[PDB]
Amino acid sequence: KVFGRCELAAAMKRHGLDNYRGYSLGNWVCAAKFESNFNTQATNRNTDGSTDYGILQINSRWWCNDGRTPGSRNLCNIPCSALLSSDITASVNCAKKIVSDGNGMNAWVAWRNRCKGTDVQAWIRGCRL
Ligand SMILES: [Cl-]
Ligand SMILES: [Cl-]
Ligand SMILES: [Cl-]
Ligand code: NA
């Protein structure tokens, strides 16, 4: 599923991401825009053989099991395919574990390079939330 900007904002708010660990909702929408272009089915292979999955591009080296990343962890206790669903619940719940891990949203390279320090509130402007 390809979400609209305000549709995704509303779904993320319903799942408790607004101000989660101090990150306002616009940070999460901005991260999703640049990680996946709002597409739940996005996948991308990394040089180390791991793969990133879903709207927040969660990586199989640590967070989910895809059966083809030897020596990796599955800290969210989910198959990586669950992160591609049109229902964002699994992605949100796993993202909450990632952002609590110590480095905050710096875990998402696109957030660090394209959202951090910008006017992230623009990503939720005009939305009925
Ligand atoms: Cl915001
Ligand atoms: Cl594996
Ligand atoms: Cl933080
Ligand atoms: Na894994």
From Swiss-Prot:
A GO BP annotation: defense response to Gram-negative bacterium
Domain C-type lysozyme: residue ranges: 1-129
Tissue specificity note: In the egg white and polymorphonuclear leukocytes.
GO cellular component: cytoplasm; endoplasmic reticulum; extracellular space
Residues that bind substrate: D101
Cellular localization per UniProt: Secreted
Active site: E35, D52
Keywords from the named record: Allergen, Antimicrobial, Bacteriolytic enzyme, Disulfide bond, Glycosidase, Hydrolase, Secreted, Signal
Catalysed transformations (reactions): Hydrolysis of (1->4)-beta-linkages between N-acetylmuramic acid and N-acetyl-D-glucosamine residues in a peptidoglycan and between N-acetyl-D-glucosamine residues in chitodextrins
GO molecular function, one term: beta-N-acetylglucosaminidase activity
EC number per UniProt: 3.2.1.17
Disulfide bond residue pairs: C6-C127, C30-C115, C64-C80, C76-C94
A Pfam family of this chain: Lys
Similarity comment: family membership: Belongs to the glycosyl hydrolase 22 family.
The protein's role, per its UniProt record: Lysozymes have primarily a bacteriolytic function; those in tissues and body fluids are associated with the monocyte-macrophage system and enhance the activity of immunoagents. Has bacteriolytic activity against M.luteus.
Subunit relationships: Monomer.
Additional detail: Lysozyme C is capable of both hydrolysis and transglycosylation; it also shows a slight esterase activity. It acts rapidly on both peptide-substituted and unsubstituted peptidoglycan, and slowly on chitin oligosaccharides.
Name recorded for this polypeptide: Lysozyme C
Origin species: Gallus gallus (Chicken)
